Amino acid sequence: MKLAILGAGCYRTHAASGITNFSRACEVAEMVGKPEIAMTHSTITMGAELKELAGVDEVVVADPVFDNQFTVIDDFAYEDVIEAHKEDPEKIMPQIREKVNEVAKELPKPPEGAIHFTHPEDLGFEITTDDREAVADADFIMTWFPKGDMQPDIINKFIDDIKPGAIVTHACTIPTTKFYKIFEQKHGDLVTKPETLNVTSYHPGAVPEMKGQVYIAEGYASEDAIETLFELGQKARGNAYRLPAELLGPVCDMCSALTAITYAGILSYRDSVTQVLGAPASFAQMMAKESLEQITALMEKVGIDKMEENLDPGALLGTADSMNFGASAEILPTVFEILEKRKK
Amino acid sequence: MKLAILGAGCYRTHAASGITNFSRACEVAEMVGKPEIAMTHSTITMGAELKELAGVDEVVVADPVFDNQFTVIDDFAYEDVIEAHKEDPEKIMPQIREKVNEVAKELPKPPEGAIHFTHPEDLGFEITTDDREAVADADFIMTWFPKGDMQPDIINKFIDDIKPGAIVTHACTIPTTKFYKIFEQKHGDLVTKPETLNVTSYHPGAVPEMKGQVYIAEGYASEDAIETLFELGQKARGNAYRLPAELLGPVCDMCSALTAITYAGILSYRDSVTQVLGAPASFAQMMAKESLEQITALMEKVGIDKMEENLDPGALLGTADSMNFGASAEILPTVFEILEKRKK
Ligand SMILES: C=Nc1ccc2ccccc2c1
Ligand SMILES: C=Nc1ccc2ccccc2c1
Numbered sequence: 001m002k003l004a005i006l007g008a009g010c011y012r013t014h015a016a017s018g019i020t021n022f023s024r025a026c027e028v029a030e031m032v033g034k035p036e037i038a039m040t041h042s043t044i045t046m047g048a049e050l051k052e053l054a055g056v057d058e059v060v061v062a063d064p065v066f067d068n069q070f071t072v073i074d075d076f077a078y079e080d081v082i083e084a085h086k087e088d089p090e091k092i093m094p095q096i097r098e099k100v101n102e103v104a105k106e107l108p109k110p111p112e113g114a115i116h117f118t119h120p121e122d123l124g125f126e127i128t129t130d131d132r133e134a135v136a137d138a139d140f141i142m143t144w145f146p147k148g149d150m151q152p153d154i155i156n157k158f159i160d161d162i163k164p165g166a167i168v169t170h171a172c173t174i175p176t177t178k179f180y181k182i183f184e185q186k187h188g189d190l191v192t193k194p195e196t197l198n199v200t201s202y203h204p205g206a207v208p209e210m211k212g213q214v215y216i217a218e219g220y221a222s223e224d225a226i227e228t229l230f231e232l233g234q235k236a237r238g239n240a241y242r243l244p245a246e247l248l249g250p251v252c253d254m255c256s257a258l259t260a261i262t263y264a265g266i267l268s269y270r271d272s273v274t275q276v277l278g279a280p281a282s283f284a285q286m287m288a289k290e291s292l293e294q295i296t297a298l299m300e301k302v303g304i305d306k307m308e309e310n311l312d313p314g315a316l317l318g319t320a321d322s323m324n325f326g327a328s329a330e331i332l333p334t335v336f337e338i339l340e341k342r343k344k
Numbered sequence: 345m346k347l348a349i350l351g352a353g354c355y356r357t358h359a360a361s362g363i364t365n366f367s368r369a370c371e372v373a374e375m376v377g378k379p380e381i382a383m384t385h386s387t388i389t390m391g392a393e394l395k396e397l398a399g400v401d402e403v404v405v406a407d408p409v410f411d412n413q414f415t416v417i418d419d420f421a422y423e424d425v426i427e428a429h430k431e432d433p434e435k436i437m438p439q440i441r442e443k444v445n446e447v448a449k450e451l452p453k454p455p456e457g458a459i460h461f462t463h464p465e466d467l468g469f470e471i472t473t474d475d476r477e478a479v480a481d482a483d484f485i486m487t488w489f490p491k492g493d494m495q496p497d498i499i500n501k502f503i504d505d506i507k508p509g510a511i512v513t514h515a516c517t518i519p520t521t522k523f524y525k526i527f528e529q530k531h532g533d534l535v536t537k538p539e540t541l542n543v544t545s546y547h548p549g550a551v552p553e554m555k556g557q558v559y560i561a562e563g564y565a566s567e568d569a570i571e572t573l574f575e576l577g578q579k580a581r582g583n584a585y586r587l588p589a590e591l592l593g594p595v596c597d598m599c600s601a602l603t604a605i606t607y608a609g610i611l612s613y614r615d616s617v618t619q620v621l622g623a624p625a626s627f628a629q630m631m632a633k634e635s636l637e638q639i640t641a642l643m644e645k646v647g648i649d650k651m652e653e654n655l656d657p658g659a660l661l662g663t664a665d666s667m668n669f670g671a672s673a674e675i676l677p678t679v680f681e682i683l684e685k686r687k688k
Contacts, residue, residue, distance in 0.1 A: 205663045213662040241659040244645075250638045251659055255631035257616065257667035257676060260660040261609030262639050264679045267657065267686060269602040270648045277598075285648035291599035292640040294590050295606050296633065301588075304614050304632060305625035313611065315585040315595050316604040318557045319549045322363075323601030331605055334678040338608040 003056050004134040005125075007144030008063040008070075009042025010114040012107075014207050015100035021089040024238075025209035026082050028053065035078035038085075039117035041209040043144045046202070048123055049236035056232070060126040062134035064111035071107065073117050075099055110146065131158040140167045140229075142202055147173045152182045159186060164193050167225050169202040172252065176201055176217040176245035198225035201245075202233065205252045212238030215252055217245035262292075264331060272326030314343025347400050348478040349469075350498075351488030352407040352414075353386025354458040356451075358551050359444030365433035368582075369553040370426050372397065379422035382429075383461035385553040387488045390546070392467055393580035400576070404470040406478035413457035419443055420461065454490070475502040484511045484576075486546055491517045499526050508537045511569050513546035516596065520545055520561045520589035542569035545589075546577065549596040556582030559596055561589035606636075608675060616670035658687025 014020045022038060025045050029037035032052045040048050043061070050056040063070075076096060084092040100115055107113035121127055128134050135141055135158045145151045151174055159182075162168065170179040179199060186194045198221035205215050214233040218226055226242055233240035243251060250259040266288055273284040302310050316339050324332045358364045366382060369389050373381035376396045384392050387405070394400040407414075420440060428436035444459055451457035465471055472478050479485055479502050489495050495518055503526075506512065514523040523543065530538045542565035549559050558577040562570055570586055577584035587595060594603040610632055617628040646654050660683050668676045 206666065211662055215659070239658070239662065241656050243655050243659060244638075244642060246638050247642060247655060250635040251655070252663050253631065254617065254621075254667065255613070255635040256660060256663040257672045258609050258613040258632055259635045259639055260664035260679050260683060261613070261672075261675055262606050262636065263651070263655070263657065263660065264682045265602050265605030265609070266639070266643060266648065267651065268682060269599070269605070272601070273598070274649075281647060281649035285643060287597065287599035288602050288648060289640065289644060291594040291602045292606065292636060292643075294594045295603055295610065296636040296640070298588065298591060299610060299629065299636075300633060303625060304610065304629040305618075307607070307610070311587050311591060311595075311607070312585050313607065314583070315559065315587060316600060316607060318555050318583065319596050319600040320604035322550070323598065328601045328605075330682055331678055332601060334675055335605050335608045338612060338674055339604065342611060 001056055001139040002058045002137050003047070003050060003060070003140045003142060004138035005043050005047050005059065005061040005142045005144070006063070006131055006134060007043055008061050008065060008114060008116070008120060009044065009144055010110045011041050011100055011117070012104040012109075012115050014041060014209075015097045015104070015115075018097060020207045020210050021085065021093050022081060022209045023085055023089065024212040026085040027212065029078070029082055035082060036118045036122055038078045038082045039076070040123070041116065041207065043142060043208070044116065044118070044120050044123065045208045046142070046204070046236065047120070047125060050232060051124070054232045054235040056140075058126070059124075060128055060134045060138075061120045062128045062131045063114070064129055065114040066127055067129045068111065069107060069113040070119075071103065071113065071115055072119050073099060073103065073115065076117065078118075132161045134158075135161050135163070135166075137163055138166055139163065140169070140232075142169050144171055145173055151179070152185075155182050159183065159194065160189070160192055162192065162194070162197065164196045165198065165225075167198045167200065167221070167229055169200055169229075171201065171203045172205075176220065176248055180220050198222055200226065200229060201248060202229070203248060203252055204237070208237075214240050215248060216240065216242040217248045218242055219245040266292075268327040268331050269323075272323065272328040276326040308342065308344070312344045313339045317343065345400060345483040346402040346481055347391065347394055347404070347484045347486065348482035349387045349391045349403065349405040349486045349488065350407070350475055350478065351387060352405055352409060352458060352460070352464060353388070353488055354409075354454045355385050355444055355461070356448040356453075356459055358385060358553075359441040359459075360448070362441060364551045364554050365429065365437050366425055366553050367429055367433060368556045370429040371556065373422070373426060379426060380462045380466055382422045382426045383420065383553075384467070385460065385551065387486060387552075388460065388462070388464050388467070389552045390486070390548065390558075390580065391464075391469060394576065395467070395469075398576050398579040400484075403468075404472060404478045404482075405464045406472045406475045407458070408455040408473055409458040410471055411473045412455060413451060414463075415447065415451060415457060415459055416463050417443060417447065417459060417461050476505045479505050479507070479510075481507055482510060483507065484513070484573075486513050488515055489517060495523070496526050496529075503527065503530055503538065504533070504536050506536060506538065506541065508540045509542065511542040511544065511565065511573060513544055513573070515545065515547045516549070520564065520592055524564050542566055544570065544573060545592060546573065547592065547596055548581070552581070558584050559592060560584060560586040561592045562586055563589040610636075612671040612675050613667075616667060616672040620670040652686065652688070656688045657683040661687070
């Protein structure tokens with residue numbers, strides 16, 4: 001099958017963040033015996049994995065940067081990188097960071113400049129500057145575009161060239177519904193039928209060269225298209241997660257912490273009620289819904305910064321202690337210490 | 345101020361639960377050099393507190409049980425109970441429970457029979473069988489009635505005898521909204537003016553003889569009445585919490601566990617965001633609202649029992665770990681262990 005990668009990515013913000021490495025990229029370099037994979041990033045890593053682990057035959061990358069200032073940094077041997085990532089990546093990440101930052105001081109931002117350590121040509125990818133050319137006959141279009149208002153402008157060029165029923169994906173840079181609405185603008189066209197498109201995500205939830213994982217939004221694509229993507233993603237990325245589009249943000253953005261805490265709570269609370277009190281799941285859910293909705297309404301009513309002045313965190317200490325059994329016993333003692341520090 | 349306690353309570357369910365003791369009652373009994381307080385329960389404990397610690401000299405208790413089988417168990421000395429609660433209450437609670445269970449086997453339920461260990465008369469309360477008599481001229485009416493359809497029937501018998509502006513409270517046996525709707529039925533009465541009533545809660549969120557705490561619902565009483573009840577409650581019960589009526593249930597009922605976990609989550613998340621990313625509280629709130637609303641809607645959508653088939657608990661491990669800093673570091677490691685156990 002034909003995969004069109006639209007957007008190669010730039011390394012500058014990964015380096016500037018100060019906290020990323022190539023753990024995943026190094027990992028798959030070893031898996032396939034190809035050291036140059038070790039220093040791929042972004043969409044080039046994910047393309048390497050789909051070609052070399054999932055068996056996707058043809059891969060094109062389209063980016064205007066190729067014909068502009070596409071810089072490959074050849075300072076670091078692939079093998080020294082692969083090496084340091086066995087023991088400790090922080091032996092080598094600082095200098096890589098340092099070098100990228102110096103080059104990024106003067107280099108224009110994408111699509112005028114981009115920083116890479118392995119050229120996608122060395123990986124056996126077709127490279128192109130024409131989006132429209134890249135998407136003709138693609139079954140799987142992986143978009144990786146800048147955040148904000150340029151995406152509709154970028155997409156509207158090649159949307160008519162998109163093969164009917166193709167899988168079309170986005171990453172961290174746009175929410176699914178906003179990505180969908182761009183295709184939805186054109187629903188009614190009989191010649192290519194964009195209503196037949198399977199719109200979803202291939203969102204890494206982290207820089208792809210660092211963590212082997214992908215997140216696949218459900219709600220727009222057909223079930224078949226989701227299963228296929230999930231299968232490819234499981235083989236390519238190692239860990240795949242399919243989930244409602246409406247939960248992609250809550251799961252992947254800064255609020256992931258709150259979504260984790262709350263979901264752990266719900267599951268633990270549910271199990272304590274069904275296993276220990278022996279009530280039906282519905283009784284748990286009816287209690288949980290009122291509890292979730294009301295704490296949420298409080299926050300909205302008074303402001304997240306003013307909740308304590310309205311609900312003393314200590315209020316929960318002398319009531320929740322009697323729910324400290326079953327699966328809730330795993331989390332409640334940690335919650336009591338927190339509530340304890342914050343009580344009036 | 346005249347306090348009218350309506351309903352003395354029965355010990356049977358406290359004993360039968362196997363997990364209550366007299367720690368609070370013993371503590372006040374010691375505070376005031378009055379051993380008989382040690383084995384009070386329910387409303388008698390709270391009226392003893394109000395009188396001995398909060399200066400409420402005038403206390404009437406009304407309950408039809410007084411003319412029925414009001415049964416006082418004299419098998420246990422107060423001084424031994426007080427003794428046992430200093431180090432370990434379980435050295436005396438089992439025999440107390442055994443005796444209560446025995447007597448309860450045959451004794452009819454309230455208001456036909458009730459089990460106490462100290463008669464409210466021994467604490468210098470007026471005792472009566474006439475609710476109408478008790479509420480006449482009362483400033484604070486504390487109701488303590490059976491769960492369900494009888495409360496309206498009980499209330500309508502004396503609602504016209506209620507001093508305008510009086511503070512009227514309920515505890516665990518009825519939601520604030522339903523309590524308030526009873527009085528709302530009589531709105532527009534020219535002489536009794538029930539619209540002036542200050543309706544709220546005096547809810548111990550536990551059996552009051554065990555725990556020194558009270559939860560006071562806001563939304564239906566004046567600011568002044570809440571303030572007054574709060575000050576009285578703090579003196580009498582030791583800990584007082586005033587909160588929106590809409591949170592009474594989430595805080596005090598079986599979902600208290602989930603409200604605790606979520607609230608701790610929201611607070612930790614907020615701090616990790618504001619103290620370590622430097623963003624306004626509104627930026628954290630926006631994120632928090634989407635996350636809470638969407639996890640809640642997934643639960644309602646697929647069922648609490650089927651959440652894991654739609655969102656792999658493991659999905660959160662590869663994203664939320666980026667947020668494991670600041671206050672969220674206090675709770676996240678525990679949450680990671682739980683989600684790890686539960687992943688697909
Ligand atoms: C494209 N940048 C990123 C980098 C790290 C991330 C970590 C969690 C979620 C989105 C992210 C986006
Ligand atoms: C009247 N019974 C109870 C006893 C314990 C409780 C604990 C928490 C909430 C309500 C409760 C009601």
